[PDB]
Design a protein around this nucleic acid. Structure first.
Ligand SMILES: [Mn+2]
Ligand SMILES: [Mn+2]
Ligand SMILES: [Mn+2]
Ligand SMILES: [Mn+2]
Lengths: 437, 435
RNA sequence: AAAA
């Protein structure tokens, strides 16, 4: 009969409320979720959907009371809505976490409840979740509890509370290309890994740009039709000794030939130390079978795999569980909305770390990739998420990009980190260091 | 000495504090800027730079009182700092605008001042980001600052720590010099075609055959050797040569655009593609085609969109160079520069506009991320980003919902326009920005 | 300016 209620303020960032609720739900009998109603005339959207997700993923059920506020920018209206809608039952403890919502919502909800329950029969408590030091702080009470390593969340819950659905991703055991280059993926992977370990990445990248991309990536679907491909080849042969084809046949490094010859016999782009040039007979379907997957993987997907493989090891040493706290090829969508793609995701406690990968050394493209990773992690994991971009650029460029796209939030730790070509061989350690600090 | 003090909480968004400060400045004798100190051990950065920029651009002089907080997440540390550092003079009114700062800063600065001062007039206010209203707690007023408070691009970028601001006016646009005496005729001819719903046909012709002919090796159009070899390669592919498509399948309205350039700047020799002779030096080739190609390759679209809104912004009494402009560039200290095609300021909301003739989903999406982040960096968290592309209507609606981020407003802060909007892009922007 |  001594009811204890926890009050949470539902803003546009559902994560903090989830963390606080997960930590305190066991000690409370009722939960009041104060949220915003929708009034387009005042440019105010509703946070009800967030409140619903919070109730669902925290299993509040019938203990949850939803309190709607008409205007979250007006004190008068907030106070009035409170006196009219706030639960009237007799409580012995009212706990308010005022981390979320508008500043006016926080001030007037706090003072309203402090007065309504000033009776010493009722204990009033105020809490705040600090995003900078991952701790729950109580008002007037030195008691400070770090929730950084105590509250955990899985990828599905994180995306769900942020209104994302149809979440799909891959495991190391379920990598798509492992099925496409069956019986050969492992050799292909090791050959590439050995090269990266031998500081050969920059050479591989340069070769991929020229002569590889000039040959296999010059048109929209040249590798889909034998005709166009043979034409592209014929055209290139006109440039003679400067042709990309000659460069491929005469100046391709041995380590690259080793990687190329690690592919299955029916999926190789070369016939000996020569480019395989389809004859007139080759069927368009035959061509695609032999070159599509191979070219796509070599055009970059390999880097994603390599970095993932380097990180899995270290993350297993830690408590992270694949599928829940880390994965590759993440895709999801908001209802009736276009899907997104994130190469690698990692969750440290309740912080999302998104990793985008590019083999590019060019400043312009890498810059754009940075904007992308920053926006995506914010959309799917919240405003306190970290974004990491792994590029094929040198240190000076990486440092410049970090300064270029840096945005201030009040924290001393960076939320946008850029790695470069010199970090590839030891990328796993570099990631472990940046993520787990 | 009936002194009246205004208290502001300095978060990482200085714009609302500047707006509230500019509105209430002439009513208060003292200003207490409460900001955070830096402490790496608690991952707490300092907002002192924003407080400095607020004092500078509000011209507070010695009437500004800096009040540092050591820990903006600790209620006891906040109260102790306030009790020891808040000015002790006799005030008849203490006005606290609690719009900025962390929630703990807001709660405990509000209750500390409400206890300390409230038969003395205590007042709390909050600037609504959604409806542009300064709401009072005790007087229960709600004054709209949407059309009252104005800010220029220099002040806006400076409070957000950006410096070395440069841009171009309508009458200082660069290409006007590249085509002296002829820029008008060139832009009017292009404008006439886009207003005639020829934009989609124009961009198709720019992708092929225009970019096949003039967009190859770096400096291709500045080296006769590179360019003549290139054309000779193209002529080899006679059946589908872009040179044949240029001469035989170019529509009439594009010939009128090409013929609008001066004689020494035309890509065409009569009704054919101009192929340079062997007497043509590197200087001759570059003088004829370099500026014409770069302008037709996309730069023309920046000028077109800018010219379609200039008259509509002057009708609304906005001042060029202060509230709108082209080719904005700036930077942070010792930091790389940024480039924004067009900027517009409605009241005190920044509207950044990124332009591209591209119809590709992937490239337009990357430009969407860029303009979203840039207007956030230089204009704050409540700025609007507009991306004008060449995609069809269905691709713009997808990209709009693709990059939409929920901040609590019903009005979208990321707007995407496409090829269907070019003919009336002036009205499409005016309605989106002001209505 | 709805985990500064
Ligand atoms: Mn009243
Ligand atoms: Mn599914
Ligand atoms: Mn990638
Ligand atoms: Mn542009």
């Amino acid at each position: 009969m001594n009811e204890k209620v926890l009050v949470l303020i539902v803003g546009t960032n559902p994560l903090p409320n989830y963390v606080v609720g997960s930590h305190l739900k066991e000690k409370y009998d009722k939960f009041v979720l104060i949220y915003s109603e929708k009034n387009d005339k005042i440019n105010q959207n509703s946070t009800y959907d967030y409140a619903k997700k919070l109730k669902e993923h925290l299993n509040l059920n019938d203990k949850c009371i939803f309190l709607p506020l008409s205007d979250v920018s007006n004190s008068e209206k907030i106070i009035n809505d409170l006196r009219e809608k706030f639960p009237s039952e007799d409580f012995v403890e009212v706990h308010l976490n005022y981390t979320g919502g508008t500043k006016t919502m926080v001030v007037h909800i706090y003072n309203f409840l402090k007065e309504k329950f000033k009776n010493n029969k009722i204990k009033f408590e105020g809490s705040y979740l600090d995003a900078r030091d991952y701790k729950l702080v109580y008002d007037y009470s030195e008691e400070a509890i770090s929730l950084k390593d105590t509250i955990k969340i899985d990828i599905n819950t994180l995306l769900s509370i942020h209104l994302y659905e149809d979440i799909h991703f891959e495991f190391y055991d379920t990598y798509s290309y492992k099925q496409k280059f069956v019986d050969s993926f492992d050799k292909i992977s090791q050959e590439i890994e050995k090269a990266i370990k031998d500081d050969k990445g920059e050479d591989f990248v340069k070769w991929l740009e020229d002569p590889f991309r000039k040959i296999f990536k010059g048109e929209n679907k040249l590798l889909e039709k034998t005709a166009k491909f043979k034409k592209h080849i014929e055209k290139l042969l006109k440039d003679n000794d400067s042709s990309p084809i000659v460069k491929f046949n005469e100046k391709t490094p041995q380590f690259i030939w080793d990687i190329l010859n690690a592919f299955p016999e029916g999926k190789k782009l070369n016939d000996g130390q020569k480019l395989w040039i389809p004859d007139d007979k080759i069927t368009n379907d035959n061509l695609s079978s032999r070159v599509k997957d191979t070219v796509e993987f070599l055009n970059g997907k390999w880097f994603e795999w390599y970095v993932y493989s380097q990180i899995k090891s270290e993350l297993l040493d830690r408590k992270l569980k694949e599928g829940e706290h880390f994965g590759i090829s993440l895709k999801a969508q908001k209802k009736d909305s276009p899907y997104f793609e994130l190469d690698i995701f990692l969750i440290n406690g309740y912080q999302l770390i998104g990793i985008s990968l590019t083999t590019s050394s060019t400043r312009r493209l890498c810059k754009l990739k940075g904007f992308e990773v920053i926006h995506r992690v914010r959309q799917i994991g919240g405003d306190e998420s970290k974004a990491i971009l792994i590029t094929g650029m040198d240190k000076s460029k990486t440092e410049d990009l970090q300064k270029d796209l840096a945005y201030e939030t009040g924290s001393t730790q960076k939320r946008f980190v850029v790695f470069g070509i010199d970090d590839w061989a030891d990328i796993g350690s570099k990631i472990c260091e940046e993520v787990f600090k």
